[PDB]
Amino acid sequence: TAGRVVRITGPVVDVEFPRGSVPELFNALHAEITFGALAKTLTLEVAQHLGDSLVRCISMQPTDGLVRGVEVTDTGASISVPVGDGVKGHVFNALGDCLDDPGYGKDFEHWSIHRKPPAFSDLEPRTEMLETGLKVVDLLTPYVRGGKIALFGGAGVGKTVLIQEMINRIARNFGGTSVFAGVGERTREGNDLWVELADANVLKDTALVFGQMDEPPGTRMRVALSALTMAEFFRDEQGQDVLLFIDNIFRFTQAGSEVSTLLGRMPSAVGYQPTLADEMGELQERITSTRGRSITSMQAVYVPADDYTDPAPATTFAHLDATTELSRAVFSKGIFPAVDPLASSSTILD
Amino acid sequence: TAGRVVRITGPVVDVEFPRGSVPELFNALHAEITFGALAKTLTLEVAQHLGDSLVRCISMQPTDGLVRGVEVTDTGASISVPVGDGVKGHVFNALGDCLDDPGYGKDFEHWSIHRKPPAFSDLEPRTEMLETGLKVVDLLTPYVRGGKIALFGGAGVGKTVLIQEMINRIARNFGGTSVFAGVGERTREGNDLWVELADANVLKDTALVFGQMDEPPGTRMRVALSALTMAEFFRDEQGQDVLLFIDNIFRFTQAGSEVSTLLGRMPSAVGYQPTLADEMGELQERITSTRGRSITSMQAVYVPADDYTDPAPATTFAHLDATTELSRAVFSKGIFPAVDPLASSSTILDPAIVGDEHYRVAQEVIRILQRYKDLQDIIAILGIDELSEEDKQLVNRARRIERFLSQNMMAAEQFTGQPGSTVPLKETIEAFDKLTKGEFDHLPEQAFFLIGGLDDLAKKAESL
Amino acid sequence: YTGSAIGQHWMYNGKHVLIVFDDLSKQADAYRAISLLLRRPPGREAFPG
Amino acid sequence: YTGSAIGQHWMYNGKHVLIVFDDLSKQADAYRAISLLLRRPPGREAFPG
Amino acid sequence: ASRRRAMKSATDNADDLIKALTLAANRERQAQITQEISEIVGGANAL
Amino acid sequence: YRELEAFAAFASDLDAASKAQLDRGARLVELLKQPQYSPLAVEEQVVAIF
Amino acid sequence: XXXXXXXXXXXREEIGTVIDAGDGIAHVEGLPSVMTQELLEFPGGVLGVALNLDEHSVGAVILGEFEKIEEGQQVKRTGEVLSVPVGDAFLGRVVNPLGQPIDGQGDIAAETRRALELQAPSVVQRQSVSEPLQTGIKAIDAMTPIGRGQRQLIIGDRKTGKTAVCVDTILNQREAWLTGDPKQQVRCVYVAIGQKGTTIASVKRALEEGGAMEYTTIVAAPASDAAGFKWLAPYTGSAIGQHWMYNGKHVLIVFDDLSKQADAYRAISLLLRRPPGREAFPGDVFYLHSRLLERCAKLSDELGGGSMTGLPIIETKANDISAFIPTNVISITDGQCFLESDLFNQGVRPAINVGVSVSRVGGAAQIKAMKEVAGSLRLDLSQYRELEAFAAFASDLDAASKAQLDRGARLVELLKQPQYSPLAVEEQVVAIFLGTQGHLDSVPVEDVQRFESELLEHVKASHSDIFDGIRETKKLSEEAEEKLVSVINEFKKGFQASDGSSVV
């Protein structure tokens, strides 16, 4: 009745099922690994139907030690994440289990990771300015309370300092709730943030999700959608306004580019997956603040090779109300925070 | 005997035939589209044989509404176009179907568009200069009979006036006719041209072929070969000289690259088709003179990013013999036909091919205009009073030489009512030899505008 | 990887360890060779996806 | 090639031969056509290896 | 007058530099495009 | 001569050794050109270069 | 004989099954009689386009609700190629590419249905462009005129004002729409491809503030929608537009923007395993844009004399114009307004690069009163751009060109304009008259915009007869010229500069 593994290549696994039992897309499957130190249950998301009862899936844990012909059980639903008031102040991996207190979320209400964005009927443009007390930000790139705000910049131009300053300036004074999504950030600064929030009192109302760059492409894709599912609960089910901080949102589309060749889609310009803008749009539209219930998003975007032309940055730029573009050419003059005064821009500057 | 459509992918269509009846490649096939809103007869050209009697084709029309397993009838020949005197003064698509009056010309003789260039024994063993009768063209940038001329310019630079001029010149001076090949032309500009040539009443001697941008790249590629097959008939059978316009030969290169990609052939440097130089050579070599008769060509040629190393222009500029550039800075002075005397160039301009006096006078006029072009900055910033006397005496001649390149061209006769002039070469190379020596410097600049010939300068000087 | 494994064995035992990788461009080039011999379609600059 | 072959028959007889190739870039472009139609992969400047 | 001459020289030298840099930038443009195509088409032919 | 010409193109005045070399080099460049289809026998080429 | 009889003796609508699905594509086997681009309907009420037809199975791209597709689902075929409903009831509505109402205001009273892919008007059906499309932007109507029937490209970098120029163009038409004459009433379609939902809401609110939602239809394919909708959105905008055009209306189409159109069609084509060409685009991307744009035209009087004007927008990476999509759309279109971020930052808003933007229609789109004024304007700005380096040394410059520099600096100030404030033709002609006729030369540069605005307000209040005369005759008659210069000097005697100096 359950399926079995047919083929394994890196993170991608092909599974066969009985004639009637073929699972829907985006179901979570489970597989078992039995060797010694690597012995774990493996969570495995359905990506494609290859025909003839074959299904192609993307592994959440590293596939090392999986063996061909092991049984695969369909859970019948998508990946689910625990949601509720009690989520604030605990740290979750992509799959919604608490890293500092294992088993904590097992009895909460769980929500599906995947959902469609809010319908065009429910959207209104946001035009209350957010004050941050940074000279260049409050002057040239004024931020929007309830908008979508971003930092852009090359590798190493200090995005992960500037986003931690934005947490320290906004979320301190902010009376609502907040979520942080560690999408492919370097683990050290994720721990620096976790201890910082605990040295202040802010952690009591801050949920954290991490899918840091040590994990394989499955989690680096889904962790953004998981933290976003926690935020969409706080927006819709409670109305309490919420700050969503994402770092780094490029790693989402990068992890998509990494699996895409093994899934068997022909590479597009400079080797991104051909789905890129449709794939990323189906994340970015969810973050929107529907009328009467604000989300304030602050997401840092990496630009590969400092190339502001590159498909990922160039696609992302349409989705944003204020962009604080950092540049290595300004950083090399010692100017800190190293924002580019000319390329940075805002829609609320009317 | 009929085939079936077996696979469809965008403009590309595969057909299967009975084992013994597989069509020869480059045959035209017909297929039907039966859906009410999109009813068409769909013309396919055969590109490859895939084995198993399957034939790879490309569609000359949009494939929307086509259904698998419809019947395909081979015509048993290449794409064929009507030829004869009754082609003149009509507009045709690449496939030889008339746009001005549908069903016209079905009764004409039809020729295969895919035919070989002349045999080696028949080519003329030396280049002959074309005495077109325009001062600036004949002196600075002589045209080659049966050669190819590149043209550069745009709107508000007289380009359509120069086309009407050259059409009148070929009809009246050489007893020939013109063909115009709209290779990927704008449908608005194609209608503006059709109305302009009708209002000038030159259309009676011109055959128009449009491959519009609206249609798939198979048609934007084959249109140039269609127009060239009309011109080949006029050269060979009627025994006339012919002038073939192409606008724009870059879109012939581009259309070829896109067809090659649809056929899945691997792309070369910067993404052109791998056959590029032969794809182009099989067009450009076919424009030539034989047995004392000639197909002259004017070709507008776009350059991508303005670099003359890109394979599209680098290929094209191997073939062509002359280069006329039109300049807005000349047109805004009122100098018609606005041919830029310094940026234009020609390769026949050598003492071995034109007389030593012609070459000397062309080198002197270029020197004088180059000096004036170098002084124009001082003139604009500081005024003529900042010059010496020796160079101000040069500028006094350069102003007059620049004016005297202008002509009352026959295309203007619609408006001015005065006739157009046709100066002999042996007149214009005297007139510029005298004018560079300054013998006419006592005349005002208005005496040289639109003037035509030297005896006309003598008349206009005594009128003023 | 073996350098990191030898390192981690002392790390978890409460020792302080310094690793030098000299140099990771040659490791990237080796992984490229391995992937292309296994006929994976490469991503950008012919590197593995 | 055929130009050189016409030449070599005289050369090995002890004649003196002169060959002008006009021009050898267009032969390289023809070989680039024949190779890419064979679907061999391109090297530098789209030329085959 | 020496300033005039030295500035005419500098202008000619800048014009020849813009020429040479443009000719490099075009060879780089073409090489970049051809590399991007070779990478895509190699990716397709692997499948 | 070619590198000297490139240098001296904007030199207001120069040493006599440069000026003599510059004039020799200009006369030698003028010497080396010839018209098309005019093959000179080597017995004449040697004298032309002498 | 016997073989033919055996064959003739050997010789309910079909339902296919999904054999494959992934990433937005499904393959459906069977359907022997399906046609290319037939609408397929899947069991969850989701739709597909049957875009590829292999020997075994149909490749169908899926519109929107892709998650609901599983292997072994039944696929029914609708009996028709892609069609959209059309009519007047679309005015002031927001619709997805299939003509379904997205604003939730209620159902649409669809008047008729059109196929997405009908033939464009052929070269015999058209007429020459000879009627203005008043943009209400001084830097456009005075220098790169748009005539109703032209295809004008608003090519620029991101955040340079492309959306603002097109919104101004749509807002400007209200001055015509309030008149009852169908020969003047320009209808408008704004087609948003891959915009975020709040940006479409912002644009709708900007058009509501201006009252343009009386006569404009928004086609919304927001970035959340599957690649199939982004790919269709320009075509459905053109298909809604053509119904009005063929009834002898005038239509303006704005496509915002064709770069995300081309990126959606590249996504679809690569997933279908079609061969990639330059910049990973499939072979036919020129044909994709061309068969869209060449449907804009002016029809002849035999077809009711209607017209459609296309303003395709495209976005250029790092100001290059040698990328594939820019090069195609520049080769297709009739005129190209380059918007440059450098001019934007230097204060020239809107950022029209008047030194490189051109229009091939030219004077034939302008009214005579505009020709009589704007004729020298391009030459004055070209001379100013040449002289610009000498601004540092203007003492040593000859006076006869020092005046050209001071004129040019005032013309560059005269061409600036605040967003959402389009000027009617009769006001912009007077604005350009101030500069070109030299009356502005005595005003200090930093006060020019305040002088121009105060004058146009004064003339509208006290001397509306000049504006009436210009609008009703389309010519600046000598009486109106003399009266206008008298009123300009009468105004100068009351005006004051920001430094407190007089200006007389």
What DSSP line would sit under A136-170, residue for residue? Answer: HHHHHS-EETTSEEEEEE-TTSSHHHHHHHHIIII
Omega within 30 of 0 (cis) for the link into B337: yes
Partners of G358 in the beta sheet? G336
Q: Show the tokens assigned to G419.
A: 């967003």
Radius of gyration of chain C (CA): 15
Return the H-helix or E-strand segment holding B243: strand B242-247
Partners of G370 in the beta sheet? none
Rounded to whole angstroms, the Cα distance separating B345 from B362 reads 11
CB contact under 8 A, B310 and E37: no
* Experimental determination technique: cryo-EM
Residues in chain B: 464
DSSP string covering G117-180: TPPPPPTTTB----SB-----HHHHTTS--BTT-BEE--B-TTSSHHHHHHHHHHHTHHHHTS-
Whole-angstrom distance between the N-terminal and C-terminal Cα of chain C?
19
CA distance D20 to chain E (A): 29
Catalytic residue of the set G291, G360, G450, G471: G360
Nearest to G67 by CA among G51, G50, G44: G44
The conformation of residue A171, written as its DSSP 8-state character, comes to I
Q: Considering only alpha carbons, which residue of chain B is nearest residue E30?
A: B270
Does the CA dihedral B362-B368-B371-B377 come out positive or negative? Answer: negative
Residues in chain D: 49
Tell me the three state secondary structure of residue B107.
Answer: coil
Rounded to whole angstroms, the Cα distance separating B82 from A137 reads 70
Nearest to E33 by CA among B313, D40, G158, D42: D42
Rounded to whole angstroms, the Cα distance separating A211 from A113 reads 14
Rounded to whole angstroms, the Cα distance separating B178 from B234 reads 9
G52 touching chain B per CB within 8 A = yes
Does the CA dihedral A283-A289-A293-A296 come out positive or negative? Answer: positive
Domain residue extents for chain B: 1-78, 80-347, 349-464
- B231-256 burial, b at 16+ Cβ within 10 Å, e below that, comes to bbbbbbeeebbbbbbbbbbbbbbbbb
Rounded to whole angstroms, the Cα distance separating G346 from G355 reads 15
Nearest to G31 by CA among G50, G44, G5: G50
- Whether the CB-CB separation of B14 and B54 falls below 8 Å is answered with yes
CB contact under 8 A, E45 and D45: no
Nearest to B331 by CA among B157, B72, B176: B157
For residue F31, how far is the Cα from the chain centroid? 7
Q: What are phi and psi of A162, to 5 degrees?
A: -60, -40
CB contact under 8 A, D39 and E34: no
Nearest to A47 among G22, G194, G267 (CB): G22
Q: Show the tokens assigned to F48.
A: 């032309």
Tell me the three state secondary structure of residue C48.
Answer: coil
Does the CA dihedral A263-A269-A272-A274 come out positive or negative? Answer: negative
Interface present between C and F (3 or more CB pairs within 8 Å)? no
Nearest to G217 by CA among G166, G175, G258, G252: G252
Rounded to whole angstroms, the Cα distance separating B178 from A282 reads 57
F10 touching chain E per CB within 8 A = yes
Omega within 30 of 0 (cis) for the link into A199: no
Q: Is A185 a catalytic residue?
A: yes
Where are the strands (E) in B17-152, listed by range? Answer: 27-33, 40-51, 54-59, 71-78, 80-83, 91-92, 109-112, 129-130, 143-144, 148-152
Nearest to G136 by CA among G387, G378, G421: G421
CA distance F25 to chain E (A): 22
Rounded to whole angstroms, the Cα distance separating A53 from A48 reads 11
CB contact under 8 A, B188 and G297: yes
Does the CA dihedral A9-A13-A18-A19 come out positive or negative? Answer: negative
Rounded to whole angstroms, the Cα distance separating B150 from B301 reads 6
Strands in A148-153's sheet, in edge-to-edge order, are A91-92, A206-211, A177-183, A242-247, A295-302, A148-153, A322-325, A345-346
Residues in chain F: 50
- Sorted by sequence, the CB contacts under 8 Å of residue B79 that are 6+ apart come out as B26, B28, B43, B45, B60, B94, B95, B96, B112, B113, B114, B222, B226
Radius of gyration of chain F (CA): 15
- Whether the CB-CB separation of G234 and A291 falls below 8 Å is answered with no
- Sorted by sequence, the CB contacts under 8 Å of residue G27 that are 6+ apart come out as A51, G18, G19, G20, G21, G54, G57, G58, G59, G60
Nearest to E30 among B266, B267, B269 (CB): B269
Rounded to whole angstroms, the Cα distance separating G70 from A22 reads 8
Q: Show the tokens assigned to G299.
A: 């029809």
CB atoms within 10 A of CB G334: 24
Amino acid letter for position G397: L
Burial (Cβ within 10 Å: 0-12, 13-18, ≥19) of residue A332:
exposed
Q: What are phi and psi of B118, to 5 degrees?
A: -60, 150
The conformation of residue A336, written as its DSSP 8-state character, comes to S
Q: Considering only alpha carbons, which residue of chain E is nearest residue F12?
A: E2
Rounded to whole angstroms, the Cα distance separating G474 from G372 reads 11
Could you tell me the resolution of this structure in angstroms?
3.7
Rounded to whole angstroms, the Cα distance separating B124 from A32 reads 83
Rounded to whole angstroms, the Cα distance separating C44 from A272 reads 8
Residues of chain E with C-beta less than 8 angstroms from the C-beta of B270: 30, 33-34, 37
Does the CA dihedral B275-B278-B282-B288 come out positive or negative? Answer: positive
- Whether the CB-CB separation of G196 and A319 falls below 8 Å is answered with yes
Rounded to whole angstroms, the Cα distance separating B33 from B60 reads 13
Rounded to whole angstroms, the Cα distance separating B288 from B235 reads 10
The helices-and-strands tally (H runs, E runs) of chain D is: 2, 0
CB contact under 8 A, A267 and E36: no
HSE-CB at G1 with a 13 A cutoff on CA atoms is: 0
- Whether the CB-CB separation of G174 and G210 falls below 8 Å is answered with yes
Radius of gyration of chain G (CA): 27
Interface present between E and F (3 or more CB pairs within 8 Å)? yes
Q: Write the CA distances from G490 to G455, G483, G498, G504, integer angstroms.
A: 10, 10, 19, 10
Tell me the three state secondary structure of residue A92.
Answer: strand
Q: Is A148 a catalytic residue?
A: no
Residues of chain G with C-beta less than 8 angstroms from the C-beta of A48: 20-23
- Sorted by sequence, the CB contacts under 8 Å of residue C34 that are 6+ apart come out as none
B388 touching chain E per CB within 8 A = no
Rounded to whole angstroms, the Cα distance separating G428 from G415 reads 10
